[PDB]
Amino acid sequence: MKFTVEREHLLKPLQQVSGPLGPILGNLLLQVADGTLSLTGTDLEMEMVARVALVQPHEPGATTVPARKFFDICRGLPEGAEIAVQLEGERMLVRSGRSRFSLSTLPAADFPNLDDWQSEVEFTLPQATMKRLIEATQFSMAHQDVRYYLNGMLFETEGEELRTVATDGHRLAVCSMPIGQSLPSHSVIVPRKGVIELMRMLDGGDNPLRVQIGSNNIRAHVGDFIFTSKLVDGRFPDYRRVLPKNPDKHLEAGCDLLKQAFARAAILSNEKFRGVRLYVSENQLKITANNPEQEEAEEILDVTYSGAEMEIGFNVSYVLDVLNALKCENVRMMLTDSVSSVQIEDAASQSAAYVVMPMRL
Amino acid sequence: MKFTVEREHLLKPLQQVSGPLGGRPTLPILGNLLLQVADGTLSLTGTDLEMEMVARVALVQPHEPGATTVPARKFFDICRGLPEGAEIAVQLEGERMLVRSGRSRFSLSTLPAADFPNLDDWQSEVEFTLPQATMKRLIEATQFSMAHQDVRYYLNGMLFETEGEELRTVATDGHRLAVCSMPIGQSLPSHSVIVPRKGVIELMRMLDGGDNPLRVQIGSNNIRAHVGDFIFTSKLVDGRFPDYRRVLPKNPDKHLEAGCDLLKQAFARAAILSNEKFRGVRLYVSENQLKITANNPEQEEAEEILDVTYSGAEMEIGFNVSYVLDVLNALKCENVRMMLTDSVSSVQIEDAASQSAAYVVMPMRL
Ligand SMILES: NC(=O)Cn1c2c(c3cc(Cl)ccc31)CC[C@@H](C(=O)O)C2
Ligand SMILES: NC(=O)Cn1c2c(c3cc(Cl)ccc31)CC[C@@H](C(=O)O)C2
Ligand SMILES: [Ca+2]
């Protein structure tokens, strides 16, 4: 196996395939075949593959090498460097200028594959749209809940919309985007680690994303990268049951002003229960916090609100996470009563909605 | 006690006086800042009983004298969290301190200013003034080589040595050494003291980059640094420091000069395949050429060759590549000078253009 490739063509692929990797699971599979260098990394649940066209002379074959070490060496070489690689006995030689490295290998035959599977649902969308969908909701996924089905993100197709849902059983995020195709009605749960890799492969370019979903797998193809993940089992909750039935009380406020006010008030909230009380009244919002030491914060903001007066308590971190994810000018808070969930949206778009539960203070 | 002060006029002082505060105070009031309004000035003080920082703020709006203490982290976070250019009005009400700005209001718990501790009184024996850039350079050149929590407590800090008209800093962790020496345009007694590492970092960070000169006063057991509105005081480390003179190699006659970034990048690549614990790399030096090799227990191998300026006898030497990279990162120079003797002697490293800072690293066999 021999190839010679510019650093610039090798670096982004290596970065992508090597990022998550950690004995042969800590190596990248390199294969020279059909005019192409393929690089693959896996943790047995998901797999990233990059293809790189070889325009210089090359020789076929495959091996595996320590991913981090190989990435670090390539990244450490100067801009414009050419990287020549070849196999020698049990080692992989890497030469660039007068820099030389000999790395250990494990056999390509020992490198594990995901089980074969069949595509049942397929669609295309812009990368920016997938990016928006994941970024809108990803912060609301559980991390290591014993309900495994929450440690990931629902991807749902309905009509012409691709929708993401994430919840940790305390708060929820949902985002729907039209993608201009007639889609079957379907949903799957992508594990949180898979969601992070998928997000990270979105380069910021114009190449559309192609998505393939099977009964137990999802695949995303963008440019010369192919990501594959296993899916999570279990019944994901229904966001329509979490969204309030009819949140007819509508408050609108500047997103950054609201964020700042909540973050200041939070300073004098209980460290155990970092909650704040909201008093909504005609065109005014009052936020208060207090703690065991009898310390007290109060913030008063102008808002647009016509509706009955009410008081409701929230976890401040959940509201700040939402406001930070919206990145908007104005927010709409849609209220029911003092003991029911609140829905929050960008005042200028219904494309994403967030649900937070009231908090006993 | 009443004052009304622009947010920004409070933030830099608050940053400074919060630095001494230890994570788990020995007394409740050690988690607080002392606030005093007197003769047109707000003073703020934070301490950990070993060192103290005081900041002064001129009060141009109406004020009322008095003193109290408030929780440092909460008061800072409130001031920082208020909007750009906010006016911050503070007044003492019972054992609460009220803070208001716009339509934001906060009530903080206080502790009596009478309980706020002071450092022991002392007399200044050695004093000098210098540009704050000179002090910044001295500390930044050497700080990375101080020990961290060594039982050899005299290493957990930095020596400050006065001689003639020069101020010198030295730091070592008992493995590698950094020294920097700068003239300061004032005749000084021959003296040296050890500043504890926490104090060194506080001192470094009180230097804002501006044109205010720094006045240093050294006592038998204490040091004080005054710049602008800020006054820092620390105990000294009561120990004996090693002599840096004895570790500098004698008459190193084989000087290698190379571009700093080129040399740094070659070592950084070679380091990838060095032993993770002991980090040894080998240099082979020859006419205008350097070869660096590394290998690890998995028998992986790196080799770098680069052009350098070198006319000495051919030799080999090994070093800890982590120590050499730390030096190159501290130097941030155009060209570096490695002053070599032989395979069983230390190396002295300097900016090729300046003898002000020098670093010594020990040889390794492989
Ligand atoms: N945590 C609860 O009691 C109910 N609850 C649940 C969820 C939820 C979400 C919100 Cl915003 C608000 C409340 C929510 C999602 C997970 C559900 C489950 O156990 O499968 C339960
Ligand atoms: N001489 C020694 O055993 C190690 N050593 C020591 C020092 C040292 C410095 C260098 Cl660069 C290199 C090596 C160094 C200074 C601190 C000394 C002590 O124990 O008080 C010991
Ligand atoms: Ca092997």
Ligand SMILES: [Ca+2]
């Ligand atoms: Ca939606």
Ligand SMILES: [Ca+2]
């Ligand atoms: Ca704006």
Ligand SMILES: [Ca+2]
């Ligand atoms: Ca109800």
Ligand SMILES: [Cl-]
């Ligand atoms: Cl604000």
Ligand SMILES: [Cl-]
């Ligand atoms: Cl070892």
